[PDB]
């Protein structure tokens, strides 16, 4: 079905945008991240697809799971962290929205070598 690279774009890319306090509530729903369960934590990156793809050629770092295919951006990037609230109950998933400017760390795979997993922000 959906490729890993497409799944990364669906879950994590929002180049279209200044996020509101309801941003995560709307985006987690519209990107199908609340269909089977409320995904607890999810990050959206507001940079261009080209800039995020270029991270796979930037600073190589260890992934949280111990693999060696993670990469940290040389520059900070505009991102939005979505974190499920305590009062969230499926299927009415509820999220706190936090914008930040941080370096991102993604896992890269394949040919062409593209992001397939959002590992962390630092």
From Swiss-Prot:
Query: In the record, what terms sit under GO molecular function?
Result: lyase activity; nucleic acid binding; ribonuclease A activity; RNA nuclease activity
Q: What is its EC number?
A: 4.6.1.18
Catalyses which reaction(s): an [RNA] containing cytidine + H2O = an [RNA]-3'-cytidine-3'-phosphate + a 5'-hydroxy-ribonucleotide-3'-[RNA]; an [RNA] containing uridine + H2O = an [RNA]-3'-uridine-3'-phosphate + a 5'-hydroxy-ribonucleotide-3'-[RNA]
| GO annotation terms (biological process) | defense response to Gram-positive bacterium
Per the Swiss-Prot or TrEMBL record, the active site comprises 12 (proton acceptor), 117 (proton donor)
Of the parent protein, the shown chain spans: 27 to 150 of 150
The name this protein carries in UniProt is: Ribonuclease pancreatic
Q: Which GO terms describe its cellular component?
A: extracellular region
**Mind telling me which residue stretches traverse the membrane in this protein?**
none
Its localization reads:
Secreted
Identify the glycosylated residues: 1, 7, 32, 35, 39
Q: Can you list the disulfide-bonded cysteine pairs?
A: 24-82, 38-93, 56-108, 63-70
Chain residues that bind substrate: 7, 10, 39-43, 64, 83
Q: Main EC class of this protein? A: lyase
């Amino acid at each position: 079905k959906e490729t890993a690279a497409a799944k990364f774009e669906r879950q994590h890319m929002d180049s279209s945008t200044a996020s509101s306090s309801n941003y995560c509530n709307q985006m987690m729903k519209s990107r199908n991240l609340t269909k089977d369960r409320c995904k607890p934590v999810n990050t959206f990156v507001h940079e261009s697809l080209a800039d995020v793809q270029a991270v796979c050629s930037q600073k190589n770092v260890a992934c949280k799971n111990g693999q060696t295919n993670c990469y940290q951006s040389y520059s900070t990037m505009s991102i939005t962290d979505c974190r499920e609230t305590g009062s969230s109950k499926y299927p009415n998933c509820a999220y706190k929205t936090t914008q930040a400017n941080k370096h991102i760390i993604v896992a890269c795979e394949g040919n062409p070598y593209v992001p397939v997993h959002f590992d962390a922000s630092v």
